[PDB]
């Protein structure tokens, strides 16, 4: 994919880089208590109902 070629390699150590949600996991509880929301990741025509329950 052309997106991969355009994408820049991950910076080994730099605050100005992709979040790498592992960091998000660490900053809000850690690996033992963090609750990953499977929602908000998929694509829908309208994001307003992205959290709705089937």
């Amino acid at each position: 994919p052309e997106s991969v070629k355009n994408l820049k390699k991950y910076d080994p150590e730099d605050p100005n880089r992709r979040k790498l949600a592992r960091d998000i996991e660490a900053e809000n509880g850690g690996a033992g208590v963090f609750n990953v929301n499977l929602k908000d990741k998929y694509l829908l025509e309208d994001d307003e109902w992205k959290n709705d329950i089937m």
Binding site: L44, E45, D46, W49, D52, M54
Partner: protein
């Protein structure tokens, strides 16, 4: 969640109910209750048992094929979960259930039609063949 149809009776099997059997053929058989599981373990044929839906479908006691039943299928191809589609399906399921109930009632009425004539003939036969009983009655 998923309600499974009993292999021996096709009845809805809710989660946490009944027993499931897995054979070396790498397929699963689900039984709603211990009765069906025991019947299957005896190698019985559901088509020969009157109390299972298989016999009724084969015997024609109930409508075996109908247009309403085509809506329910194993959707191997998923849907993108559109909110409007959810409500449309919610209404359509109720409408289809009502229509299927009406059609089943019509089929039952068509199957049971003519019993009145047979009952009347039986009553006539009983009355004609019992003159002494009627004479004593009045």
């Amino acid at each position: 969640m998923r309600i499974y149809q009993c292999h021996f009776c096709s009845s809805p099997c809710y989660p946490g109910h009944g027993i499931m059997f897995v054979r070396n053929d790498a397929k699963e058989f689900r039984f709603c209750r211990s009765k069906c599981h025991k019947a299957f373990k005896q190698r019985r044929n559901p088509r020969k048992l009157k109390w299972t839906k298989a016999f009724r479908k084969a015997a024609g006691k109930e409508l075996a094929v109908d247009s309403t039943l085509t809506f329910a299928q194993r959707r191997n191809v998923p849907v993108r979960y559109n909110r409007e589609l959810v409500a449309t399906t919610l209404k359509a399921m109720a409408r289809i259930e009502e229509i299927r109930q009406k059609r089943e009632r019509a089929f039952y009425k068509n199957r049971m039609r003519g019993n009145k004539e047979k009952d009347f003939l039986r009553d006539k036969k009983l009355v004609e063949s019992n003159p002494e009983l009627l004479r004593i009655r009045e």
